[PDB]
Design a protein around this ligand. Structure first.
Ligand SMILES: *[C@@H]1O[C@H](CO)[C@@H](O[C@@H]2O[C@H](CO)[C@@H](O)[C@H](O)[C@H]2NC(C)=O)[C@H](O)[C@H]1NC(C)=O
Ligand SMILES: *[C@@H]1O[C@H](CO)[C@@H](O)[C@H](O)[C@H]1NC(C)=O
Ligand SMILES: *[C@@H]1O[C@H](CO)[C@@H](O)[C@H](O)[C@H]1NC(C)=O
Ligand SMILES: *[C@@H]1O[C@H](CO)[C@@H](O)[C@H](O)[C@H]1NC(C)=O
Ligand SMILES: *[C@@H]1O[C@H](CO)[C@@H](O)[C@H](O)[C@H]1NC(C)=O
Ligand SMILES: *[C@@H]1O[C@H](CO)[C@@H](O)[C@H](O)[C@H]1NC(C)=O
Ligand SMILES: *[C@@H]1O[C@H](CO)[C@@H](O)[C@H](O)[C@H]1NC(C)=O
Lengths: 49, 175, 246, 49, 49, 49
């Protein structure tokens, strides 16, 4: 539910009102944040294991 | 005679629908257990938004006037209720009317309001409660629903009630 | 594999003939605000009549204004000169942004301005449109100050016959023999919201029948998505258009 | 071909039938915004060829 | 020839002297003054539609 | 809760009269450089001229 500095946290809200030229930088801020959140989860799970 | 406002005057800080959540927000609110000034009609200041509570039994208070200088050199909005329907007019009144834009005609007790002016919009929130006979603002907790926002692009820095009871005024602070 | 497009029952066209083609726009210091509701914002019937020098949208994209659907739209109209069109923007300073008309930092809308020298300019001069150039402090966003009291730098009232007393409104002097930098321009600023309330004004997209239990691309009031559609037993508020999760 | 909003052929003597080509009317006494401009668009590739 | 507009996408105009292309296509036409802004990627109007 | 603004003891207004209003500027190939010191840069007295 976090947006990581983008206009909104919903990926179907950026693609609904931004063209293919402006939405490249807004999507690529959500992908990086969600990737690092998943990586933090995997590191914590490895230490717990 | 100053009184306290205990857990009173909680409005909706935005217009986003959200349910079954917990929201931690930083906004202009009336702080809990804060001072309120009670009047049993001076030109009261309007610092950042007000909580205006009217404890009335025979409809003494009716409407407000908001302005900058309360002259005919500045825009001023009146929101009164002439016993039938509510009228809203923003003109250069002589506190006749000229050079003016907005107009809107729409068709013991405690009536409590929150007025907030931001981004050229005057937000008015309203709440109601069946008080018993007192001489003080009672404790409790009543949330305030949003009734209407007006596109009045003016500075509001003074206000003044319009009478034909008592009323309490408190100022909003960023908390 | 599929497309589902659902839009409300709106058929009226928005008043492009009364907001863009009017006999006189107001001055910049007394800009006029008008509400637009319950119509179909086409933007394609203007290709034959009105040619736009500036058309820039903030918070949305201009190519996506046909399949996006708004809640309420406000139009602010006024007249500036040629090189003051660059100050009708967020995050800007100057004489129009300070003392006449200020846009919010988090503005979401469209600024559109076009040149009118055939109707707003006269051979002898059109000294009707005025702007304010003296004021005690700047303006909060989306405010206006149509007062005409004389100005004194110390902060006391005076008579403009006396010294250090000035009238605070200058006249735009428009001619027919001057470059674009001092030629009249009509400006319209449109403000959108896109809330959860039911929609009033939006663009010309044809509707398609509902396809259920299939992986489709749907479009409900400008909400692009992908997924299967099933009948629901949920309970909404009377004003709600969608619901979300944790 | 002449244009008709319903999507059927028509003759432009009739009604709701238009020729879909306007003429640019260029004069020597008009501002910069309605003066002729020549445009050249250059496309590069930068391949391994 | 004095250029009123000279904007390069995907490359930089200062780097067109030490850069070497594979094939270049030139598309030429004439527009009016305030339609030069519609020759851009991700644009709308009457020239771009 | 409080505001503290401290600025040096400068009261002169910068030469907006001698910089922006001169009888001639140099050509672009022989551009002129001038130093500005010890004044208050208003930028708001130019709204009239
Ligand atoms: C709305 O009106 C008030 C009062 O007229 C304005 O407050 C003035 O602000 C200037 C700023 O320097 C002061 O010099 C004046 O002394 C203030 N007035 C008074 C009576 O003290 C206020 O600025 C106006 N709102 C806006 C947005 O300009
Ligand atoms: C009201 O204000 C006074 C200051 O004069 C303060 O001492 C008092 O605590 C306030 N009331 C409450 C309930 O806090
Ligand atoms: C209303 O405006 C007029 C016009 O200047 C003025 O003469 C009059 O004094 C104003 N009213 C008040 C109450 O000042
Ligand atoms: C209240 O004011 C409105 C606005 O002029 C008017 O139409 C209405 O008749 C008034 N009602 C009474 C009872 O005066
Ligand atoms: C305000 O009233 C005066 C009266 O002479 C008029 O000249 C002026 O145009 C008016 N301004 C607005 C913004 O209505
Ligand atoms: C376009 O404009 C021309 C010039 O006024 C007019 O003759 C023609 O009918 C217009 N076409 C449409 C479809 O409005
Ligand atoms: C602004 O310019 C006008 C035109 O020259 C002049 O009459 C007026 O005195 C100027 N005002 C100030 C405050 O310089």
């Amino acid at each position: 539910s976090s947006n990581f500095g983008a206009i909104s946290s919903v990926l179907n809200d950026i693609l609904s009102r931004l063209d293919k030229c402006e939405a490249e930088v807004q999507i690529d801020r959500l992908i990086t944040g969600r990737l690092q959140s998943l990586q933090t989860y995997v590191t914590q799970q490895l230490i717990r294991a | 005679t100053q009184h306290t406002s205990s857990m009173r005057g909680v409005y909706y800080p935005d217009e986003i629908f959200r349910s079954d959540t917990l929201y931690l927000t930083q906004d202009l609110f009336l702080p809990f257990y804060s001072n309120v000034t009670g009047f049993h009609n001076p030109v009261i200041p309007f610092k950042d938004g007000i909580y205006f509570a009217a404890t009335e039994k025979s409809n003494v208070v009716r409407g407000w006037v908001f302005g900058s200088t309360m002259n005919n050199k500045s825009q001023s909005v009146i929101i009164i209720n002439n016993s039938t329907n509510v009228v809203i007019r923003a003109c250069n009144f002589e506190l006749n009317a000229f050079n003016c834009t907005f107009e809107y005609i729409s068709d013991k007790h405690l009536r409590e309001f929150v007025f907030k002016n931001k981004d050229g919009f005057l937000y008015v929130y309203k709440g109601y409660q069946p008080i018993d006979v007192v001489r003080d603002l009672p404790s409790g907790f009543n949330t305030l629903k949003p009734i209407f926002k007006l596109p009045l692009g003016i500075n509001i820095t003074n206000f003044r009630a319009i009478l034909t009871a008592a009323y309490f005024v408190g100022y909003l602070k960023p908390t | 594999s599929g497309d589902v497009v659902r839009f409300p029952n709106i058929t009226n066209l928005c008043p492009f003939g009364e907001v863009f083609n009017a006999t006189k726009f107001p001055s910049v210091y007394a800009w006029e605000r008008k509400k637009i509701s319950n119509c179909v914002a086409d933007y394609s019937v203007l290709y034959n009549s009105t040619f736009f020098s500036t058309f820039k949208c903030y918070g949305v994209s201009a190519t996506k204004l046909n399949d996006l659907c708004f809640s309420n739209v406000y139009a602010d109209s006024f007249v500036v000169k040629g090189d003051d069109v660059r100050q009708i923007a967020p995050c800007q300073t100057g004489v129009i942004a300070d003392y006449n008309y200020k846009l919010p930092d988090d503005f979401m809308g469209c600024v559109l301005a076009w040149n009118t020298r055939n109707i707003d300019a006269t051979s002898t001069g059109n000294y009707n449109y005025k702007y304010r150039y003296l004021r005690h402090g700047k303006l909060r966003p989306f405010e206006r100050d149509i007062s005409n009291v004389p100005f004194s730098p110390d902060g006391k009232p005076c008579t403009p016959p006396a010294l250090n007393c000035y009238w605070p409104l200058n006249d735009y002097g428009f001619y027919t023999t001057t470059g674009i930098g001092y030629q009249p321009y009509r400006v319209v600023v449109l403000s959108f919201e896109l809330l959860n309330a039911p929609a009033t004004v939006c663009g010309p997209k044809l509707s398609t029948d509902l396809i259920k239990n299939q992986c489709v691309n749907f479009n409900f009031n400008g909400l692009t998505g992908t997924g299967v559609l099933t009948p629901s037993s949920k309970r909404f508020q009377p004003f709600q258009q969608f619901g979300r999760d944790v």
